[PDB]
């Protein structure tokens, strides 16, 4: 039975990526035929940039703000910057603004969507000008509100870019981003690539190829059948259409009898979808933001998105039936992704329990294979060979991802710290006593057994290349040749100010 | 460090059937390589069989086909079953238990237990 296990669990694994690549590379390829007619000076969408930000870094939020300003799109309306503040700490968010844009930061006393006014009019006048906001800290929904009624207050603008504060934009990603919406009438929404830069740390930089993976290739997927499930926070467009009927019941949201403050973006997005429109994702709109380079701030992060996940599932699932075919697939990736999670762990509790040395041999072998396909396509798409550094991603997913996973679905049926990392030390005890004992129970030596010496053979090979790679990583980071060519800079920037 | 125990032998005539089985007392009986040696008339301990710990089976050249080898871990007994006996096929039978060893399986010297051994006669 280990065997069927084992080759079942590999062909699921693959496959549905190799598919994905296809799909991918399919989308891409009908991004490039848009593209190509596209007439030169194309500024035929007048679009508005809503930032929100909460007590963010004053260096890379004047980087964002900077960034916004040198874009190279020659129709935008104005500038958008909603502040969850409203207290002494958050008007140093407001000098920078003044900085870079103007001395427009409004400072009114109620927030937009808990007013029986909701309409921009009521802390607004002119909409020509670049405006600031300081708000009362609420929420990223509540600013994102208050950033739409103040872009949809304006009846020449067609479309909105949401980035983060810490979002650093290339020169062409506006144009990018709110390009594919004039491509077809039924897309409504539009996800642009989004970069990690502060690749330095090894958990940044394995979390680096694990966004470079989730983006082009399963977003690509995606997008092929228009049915884009997330669109990225840092980056992404919207119809002004799609925004001024969907704002309201995505900002009255209650799951289960309460609020809900968390996948702010997966819930629009999702809301686009049960409307039956369609998303895009395109490659050349590029933002920049950076990861955690802490495991439990990433555990956290994960955590939350985790929850997010599960709240979104159910009603994308729902929602596939008015997609008609090509919503198939959507329900087929909800399916996959509910599967997954199941199949790792059965997989795992099984080979720990029967403590066969041929088995575990076995499957960490077919693991690391199949890894190292997926990062030697990273690496032939990105034109980079840190790309491989994505074989070492197994132990990320492997010892945060899933305590994150089971974290929010016990959430979703001192204190404080056993309701975040109670359940991941004990899935961290779990994995050492599992080894532990099977350690023990195996716990003898044979060379005339030549399976026997396949195990042994096998695990030290892997352990082997396991090092060969950490000491490559090391090797990179002493010299630096791991940092992103913007993280050079960034830093470069940094130490002069 | 597990103790031996043999048991088999009988009244076999010729092309019989007598299953010899030997026990083996011990902790992790799971992790240990059997192996069954028969001392012939002319004292030189030869080969017979043997079972891995991960249940690969070795026989010799002149009893390949003739002898089956099992284990039972629950039971934490071995068992040699004997087919198509031959009057050359007379010896008491040893059963050698070891846990760590080299290529070296074959040799008397390869194994550190050494239980008892159980009379096996052919008649013609």
């Known amino acids: 039975s280990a065997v069927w296990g084992i080759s079942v669990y590999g062909v699921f694994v693959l496959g549905f990526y190799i598919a994905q690549i296809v799909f991918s590379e399919f989308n891409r390829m009908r991004l490039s035929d848009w593209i190509s007619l596209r007439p030169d000076n194309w500024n035929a969408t007048r679009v508005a940039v809503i930032i929100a930000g909460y007590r963010e870094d004053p260096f890379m939020f004047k980087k964002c703000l900077e960034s916004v300003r040198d874009s190279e799109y020659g129709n935008v309306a104005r500038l958008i910057c909603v502040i969850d503040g409203d207290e002494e700490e958050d008007l140093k968010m407001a000098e920078i603004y003044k900085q870079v844009y103007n001395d427009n930061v409004k400072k009114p006393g109620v927030v937009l969507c808990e007013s029986e006014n909701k309409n921009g009019s009521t802390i607004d006048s002119d909409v020509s000008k670049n405006i600031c906001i300081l708000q009362p800290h609420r929420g990223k929904r509540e600013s994102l509100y208050t950033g739409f009624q103040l872009a949809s207050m304006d009846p020449s603008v067609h479309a909105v870019v949401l980035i983060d504060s810490d979002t650093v934009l290339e020169k062409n990603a506006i144009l990018e981003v709110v390009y594919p919406l004039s491509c077809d009438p039924n897309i409504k929404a539009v996800a642009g690539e989004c970069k990690i830069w502060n690749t330095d740390t090894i958990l940044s930089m394995l979390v680096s190829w694990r966004y470079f993976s989730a983006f082009n290739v399963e977003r690509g997927a995606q997008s092929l059948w228009k049915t884009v499930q997330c669109v990225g926070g840092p980056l992404g467009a919207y119809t002004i259409d799609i925004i001024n009927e969907i704002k309201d019941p995505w900002i009255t949201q209650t799951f289960l009898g309460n609020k809900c403050t968390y996948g702010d973006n997966r819930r629009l997005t999702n809301e686009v979808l049960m409307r039956g429109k369609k998303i895009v994702y395109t490659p050349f709109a590029v933002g920049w933001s950076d990861s955690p380079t802490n495991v439990m701030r990433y555990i956290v992060q994960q955590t939350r998105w985790s929850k997010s996940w599960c709240r979104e599932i159910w009603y994308t699932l729902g929602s596939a039936w008015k997609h008609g075919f090509s919503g198939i697939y959507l329900a087929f990736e909800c399916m996959y992704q509910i599967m997954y999670f199941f199949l790792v762990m059965y997989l795992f509790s099984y080979i720990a329990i029967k403590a066969d040395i041929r088995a575990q041999t076995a499957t960490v072998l077919v693991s690391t294979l199949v890894t190292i396909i997926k990062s030697s396509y990273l690496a032939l798409r990105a034109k980079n060979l840190k790309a491989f550094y994505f074989v070492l991603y197994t132990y990320v997913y492997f010892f945060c991802m899933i305590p994150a996973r089971i974290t929010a679905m016990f959430t979703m049926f001192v204190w404080l710290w056993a309701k975040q990392f109670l359940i991941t030390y004990m899935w961290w005890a779990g994995v050492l006593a599992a080894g532990v004992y099977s350690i023990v129970d195996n716990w003898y030596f044979d060379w005339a057994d030549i399976q026997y010496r396949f195990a042994l053979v096998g695990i030290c090979s892997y352990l082997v290349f396991v090092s060969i790679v950490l000491v490559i990583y090391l090797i990179g980071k002493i010299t630096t040749w791991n940092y992103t060519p913007l993280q050079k800079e960034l830093i470069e920037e940094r130490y002069l100010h | 460090q597990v103790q031996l125990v043999e048991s088999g032998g009988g009244l076999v005539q010729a092309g019989g059937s007598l299953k010899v089985s030997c026990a083996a007392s011990?902790?992790?009986?799971?992790?240990?390589?059997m192996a069954w040696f028969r001392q012939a008339p002319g004292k030189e301990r030869e080969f017979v069989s043997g079972i891995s710990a991960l249940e690969t089976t070795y026989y010799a050249d002149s009893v390949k086909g003739r002898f089956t080898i099992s284990r039972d871990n629950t039971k934490n007994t071995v068992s040699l079953q004997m087919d198509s006996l031959k009057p050359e096929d007379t010896a008491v039978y040893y059963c050698a238990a070891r846990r760590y060893g080299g290529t070296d399986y074959t040799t008397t010297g390869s194994y550190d237990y050494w239980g008892q051994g159980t009379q096996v006669t052919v008649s013609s």
């Open positions: 011990g902790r992790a009986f799971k992790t240990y390589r």
